[PDB]
Amino acid sequence: MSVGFIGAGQLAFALAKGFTAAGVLAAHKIMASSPDMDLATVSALRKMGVKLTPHNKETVQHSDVLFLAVKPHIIPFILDEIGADIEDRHIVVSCAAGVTISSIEKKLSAFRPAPRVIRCMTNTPVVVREGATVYATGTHAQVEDGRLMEQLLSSVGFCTEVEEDLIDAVTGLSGSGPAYAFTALDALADGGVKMGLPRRLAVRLGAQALLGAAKMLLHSEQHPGQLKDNVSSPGGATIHALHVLESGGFRSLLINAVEASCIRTRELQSMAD
Amino acid sequence: MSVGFIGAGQLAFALAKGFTAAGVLAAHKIMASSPDMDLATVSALRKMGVKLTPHNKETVQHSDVLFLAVKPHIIPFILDEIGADIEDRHIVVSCAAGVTISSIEKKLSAFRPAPRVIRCMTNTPVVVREGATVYATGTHAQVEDGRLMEQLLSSVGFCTEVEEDLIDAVTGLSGSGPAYAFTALDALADGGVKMGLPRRLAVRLGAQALLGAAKMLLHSEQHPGQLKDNVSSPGGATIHALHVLESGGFRSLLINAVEASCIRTRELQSMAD
Amino acid sequence: MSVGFIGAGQLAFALAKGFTAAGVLAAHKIMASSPDMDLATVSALRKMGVKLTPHNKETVQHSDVLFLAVKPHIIPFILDEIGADIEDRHIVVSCAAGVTISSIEKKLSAFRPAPRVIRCMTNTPVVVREGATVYATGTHAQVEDGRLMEQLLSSVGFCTEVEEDLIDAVTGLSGSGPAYAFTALDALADGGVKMGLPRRLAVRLGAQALLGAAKMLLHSEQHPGQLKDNVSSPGGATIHALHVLESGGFRSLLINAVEASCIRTRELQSMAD
Amino acid sequence: MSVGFIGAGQLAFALAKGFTAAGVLAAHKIMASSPDMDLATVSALRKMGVKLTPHNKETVQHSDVLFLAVKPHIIPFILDEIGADIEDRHIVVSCAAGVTISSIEKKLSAFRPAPRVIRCMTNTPVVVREGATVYATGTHAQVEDGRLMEQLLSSVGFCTEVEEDLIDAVTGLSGSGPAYAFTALDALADGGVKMGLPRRLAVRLGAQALLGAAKMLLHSEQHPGQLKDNVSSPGGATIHALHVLESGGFRSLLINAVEASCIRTRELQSMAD
Amino acid sequence: MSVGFIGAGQLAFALAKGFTAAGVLAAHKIMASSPDMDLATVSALRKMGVKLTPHNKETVQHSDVLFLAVKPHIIPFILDEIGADIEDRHIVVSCAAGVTISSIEKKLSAFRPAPRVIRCMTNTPVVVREGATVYATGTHAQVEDGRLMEQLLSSVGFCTEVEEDLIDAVTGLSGSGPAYAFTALDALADGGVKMGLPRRLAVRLGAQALLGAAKMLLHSEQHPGQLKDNVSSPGGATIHALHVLESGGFRSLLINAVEASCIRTRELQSMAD
Ligand SMILES: O=C(Cn1cncn1)c1ccc(F)cc1F
Ligand SMILES: O=C(Cn1cncn1)c1ccc(F)cc1F
Ligand SMILES: O=C(Cn1cncn1)c1ccc(F)cc1F
Ligand SMILES: O=C(Cn1cncn1)c1ccc(F)cc1F
Ligand SMILES: O=C(Cn1cncn1)c1ccc(F)cc1F
Secondary structure (H helix, E strand, O other), X not given: OOEEEEEOHHHHXXXXXXXXXXXXXXXXXXXXXXXXXXXXXXXXXXXHOOEEOOOHHHHHHHOOEEEXXXXXXXXXXXXXXXXXXXXXXXXXXXXXXXXXXXXXXXXXXXXXXXXXXXXXXXXXXXXXXXXXXXXXXXXXXXXXXXXXXXXXXHOOEEEEEOOHHHHHHHHXXXXXXXXXXXXXXXXXXXXXXXXXXXXXXXXXXXXXXXXXXXXXXXXXXXXXHHHHHHHOOOOOHHHHHHHHHHHOOHHHHHHHHHHHHHHHHHHHHHOOO | OOEEEEEOHHHHHHHHHHHHHHOOOOHHHEEEEOOOOOHHXXXXXXXXXXXXXXXHHHHHHHOOEEEEEOXXXXXXXXXXHHHHHOOOOOEEEEOOOOOOHHHHHHHHOOOOOOOEEEEEEOOHHHHHOOEEEEEEEOOOOOHHHHHHHHHHHHOOEEEEEOOHHHHHHHHHHHHOHHHHHHHHHHHHHHHHHHOOOOHHHHHHHHHHXXXXXXXXXXXXXXXXXXXXXXXXXXXXXXXXXXXXXXXXXXXXXXXXXXXHHHHHHHHHHHOOO | OOEEEEEOHHHHHHHHHHHHHHOOOOHHHEEEEOOOOOHHHHHHHHHHOOEEOOOHHHHHHHOOEEEEEOOOOOHHHHHHHHHHHOOOOOEEEEOOOOOOHHHHHHHHHOOOOOOEEEEEEOOHHHHHOOEEEEEEEOOOOOHHHHHHHHHHHHOOEEEEEOOHHHHHHHHHHHHOHHHHXXXXXXXXXXXXXXXXXXXXXXXXXXXXXXXXXXXXXXXXXXXXXXXXHHXXXXXXXXXXXXXXXHHOOHHHHHHHHHHHHHHHHHHHHHOOO | OOEEEEEOHHHHHHHHHHHHHHOOOOHHHEEEEOOOOOHHHHHHHHHHOOEEOOOHHHHHHHOOEEEEEOOOOOHHHHHHHHHHHOOOOOEEEEOOOOOOHHHHHHHHHOOOOOOEEEXXXXXXXXXXXXXXXXXXXXXXXXXXXXXXHHHHHHOOEEEEEOOHHHHHHHHHHHHOHHHHHHHHHHHHHHHHHHOOOOHHXXXXXXXXXXXXXXXXXXXXXXXXXXXXXHHOOOXXXXXXXXXXXXXXXXXXXXXXXXXXXXXXXXXXXXXXX | OOEEEEEOHHHHHHHHHHHHHHOOOOHHHEEEEOOOOOHHHHHHHHHHOOEEOOXXXXXXXXXXXXXXXXXXXXXXXXXXXXXHHOOOOOEEEEOOOOOOHHHHHHHHHOXXXXXEEEEEEOOHHHHHOOEEEEEEEOOOOOHXXXXXXHHHHHOOXXXXXXXXXXXXXXXXXXXXXXXXXXXXXXXXXXXXHHOOOOHHHHHHHHHHHHHHHHHHHHHOOOOHHHHHHHHOOXXXXXXXXXXXXXXXXXXXXHHHHHHHHHHHHHHHHHOOO
């Protein structure tokens, strides 16, 4: 099985690194073409053994599974460029926000009538094989196409099927989620430094605290509120800190963030019309 | 090497589960005595093979390494109860906030002159072997005692030695940290639900997002701000969500929390003497 | 088998109504004396059959269990007035904030050496037999005295024993709690009226909603957050409303309230000495 | 009579539990079909004796009173699926927000001319027989149909008839109300824990406080402000706590919540039209 | 003229790099000893040719001008270690916050009566020869010592003499100032990314904008408000952005920052006394 990447190099690098680290694909079975790929990600992909080309048509001819990371305003040009090169064997997997299955199918059907299209919402931690991925299957995706995509993406993290109309919300939650965590870890480290810890220790402790808490929740049958209750002793340090989070509307800020990212993806889709 | 637990069952259970899951000690070499241990954690330890007793003296007589989970207002009672039973072989490991090495050494020295005391600041994700632990060695701790402590606690997560005067700050960061994460995950899931995701899926995706981001930072040489920059495309969904976090002072809330937990631990110390 | 009330008439009426409605005491076995009892509560107690007198000594002479609802600045005068009338049979149950067991015992011990004293923290819903009561037993309270008080106060609601140093926190939670609820219900009814409901229906629906939710939590083994999750469909009306509560720091206000009431009771105590 | 449920399993479970606990319906006279019903509620309904089927037509053929819990975007498909199976005996009771009597009558009249339709706004505490329910009768509902639905729904809580144009406001008040209460009870318990109470005791006391206060208001002829006045002594703990609620705009947050839930139900209705 | 550094490596590295880049000192005439110097700065100083040693006495014996970067809680230990090695030729230049000239002179006078002490407040941009430095001369500093110090520190940025009681305020302004700018540049770049710029370009443009504006102010006889007026056309883009800065209290935040840093330096001094 050959895999190709067209579009944003950040997507190509993350999944190629995860796939090769998982051992589910040899690097020479991966080809990538990009217009925005920087020297760092170009050099990193070459050193991995990934094939690189400036020609999107070459990526299509190489690939069985073709990942697209192409924004809605560029989709008409790319699909017109490669549409005639899509074959019966191809599964086209689109990863950019605001690009609907319907838009891709309509554009590709101008060339061949039953394009196999899947939409993917994944995130950067696939690079350490702890991604969160959902996918939705298109009109002509065979049932084995969804199973194949789930097997591939489960090698680099959590993966499950959803209806397409949930992808905007997933984007606001686990797509953008890692950036919320990086912000939180920077701030928690600032807090540790304010209270006297060296920066490097503060970053390590905060990141380990977040990793361990998330793993506890994933391996627990308990509600996150129950785990919060279990850790906070009466009159203790943690419940005092939880009060100051509540006084700042901490919960509402995170709700605001998921909502804002989700709505922005809907706006990006409306700009494709 | 026998290990004993005296005091709060939430501490005892997490470490006993972690230690036994790590395979570094057999469950029958662990004994615990607790007054606040609930029926569920009572039944869970029995099914693991951990020995249980209502008599703290029996735990002391069984143990070589003795973990204490005793608040500062109870420390005078516990140390006077077991002080005459401390032997040369014992390493006393105190885990409660606000209890200084000096206080423990002074109370135990009324019975035997050179008690071996270590202070531990750990957190509940040791239960899934992803804890964050620091320890400080007391006046009479042998150099091999600290090495032993580090080997044992590294089996259930990150562990490093610190000066005792950093433990308050660690408490505000990685001690209370998991509760901040549980709060954040509850709110992120609420955000996913508001935007149309089923609750169970929203919890899974948010927890996976946090776990993966934390793992990325731990395995990266990059600043958390650089990893954040990598997530956000220009004009995209993520940067729109980061703006609304910033507008609410998200970073400052997390700094406030670390500070509040740290300061409260200092207040708990001021109430012991 | 006789019960007396000295002090605030609101306490006397609430417990007398509850006790007689529970059928555990006949109204004529109850005597009350008060300086602040208004004509409405005077007329209501008389119609119940409760004995009324202006002389606190008569209440003491009639009663076996003697409830005091007397603030700290009046306690020296009341205990000096009735102290010589306290007999071996008396159990003195103090209900006012800031009046410690130690203070009552010290004043009464000037007359007879071993006064049987209990502190009670109850609330006004005892009038509908759904109170929340805790009690702490004094130095000379017999073990059967605590059992007797739990049996009596369980007839008008929940009742359990606590250490005296938790009474301030209970006051902030269930003592003041009903006033938080009355405030919330007035506001929820205002919201129903704003959205088009008649006031009387809005008050009925809001009160039934709060009653039913509280009963659900009392009969559930689940965390309140899990029950909250069960109310909201994704994208639905409830989760939209929960967001606007969170944006205003709703949770933090309720924490602020418990804290403020608890701290005020400590201040009322510091003004007695 | 036989009762059927189509749609959201959370609705089916709540009412089936309440009805069977009230003894007004035998579990085997209830049939439910759902696409979102989870394993926990599947096993719970199975264990109760409720019949389960994947076929909505079977539920219709089984039922006399047919509860629908179907969102506006799914209503056209469901009513087209079961419309030909609606008989003269059926009373169709719709429970989802944004689904009007008019929409159901128009869709069902395509099959049979005078469908008997009632709209129901109920809440989760029917599971403990303390729900708050209102209903509105449709064009062809016989006078005994409203009487029957009030008798049935009164077995699980408060029930009264309203005009349909009040259902949106009831949703914001008593429909979403229990979630406001669960949020409040979690926060009140956090406050109790901050001030030194064990979590389990804090949850019990806060829930009992809210239950008792709600019962007082339901059994009182007095304004909630008058009951609030009765709880607060001058200079006392409660009035200090009420001030901090007021300083945060507590009342306005609850008004905001009722309004936000009500308006969201109107938005959900506009997506049906 | 040999120069030595004792203490924090961040201070030593910046000044050593600046001095060597300015050509006023050969790298082999510089010696540094540090306990917190990391591997990256160890290798960087070695590659420059700076001499490194773990022994502070060797640094003193090598040096004519001796820079100290030692916190007030460590100053007693350092001055006790090297005090006997101070010779008449030495100028001791202290750079740490909260360490007064008087404190240094008092500790060093225990060994030799007339120590030449200068206090320095500098910042990290000395590494690109654009530092901001002030100094105050001690009791026994010869007049040529101040001129020598100003000549040395003027090679790496702005340098002027001040009274010692201004150094805490300078610390809050130009000492901490670069960190305010780094924060501002990160945020400005986030704003550029939100509006569609690539992150690398956004950082470059924002940093160039700040550099150029600062240079304009330094080379103008004009008030910063006049320069502000000159940039803003009526109804234009800039004045619209200035309004949103004003609406958030932007100016007051920067005043808050200078004040907070200045006050913290005073607190660090009082913990030494
Ligand atoms: O780059 C994208 C999406 N994208 C496509 N064109 C512009 N943006 C992306 C990268 C990494 C990842 F894990 C997930 C993603 F969606
Ligand atoms: O319970 C404590 C400390 N404690 C002792 N007495 C009261 N509190 C604790 C529990 C789990 C954990 F991972 C870390 C801890 F410090
Ligand atoms: O009036 C009091 C306490 N009090 C005594 N003197 C001033 N205040 C009271 C009333 C009803 C109730 F249910 C609980 C109470 F604590
Ligand atoms: O689930 C619903 C309504 N619904 C139907 N389709 C989507 N939502 C519901 C559940 C329990 C309850 F008590 C009241 C309700 F309206
Ligand atoms: O590190 C310090 C001061 N310091 C000394 N011990 C702890 N802190 C410092 C570093 C670089 C700089 F440019 C200016 C400085 F003051």
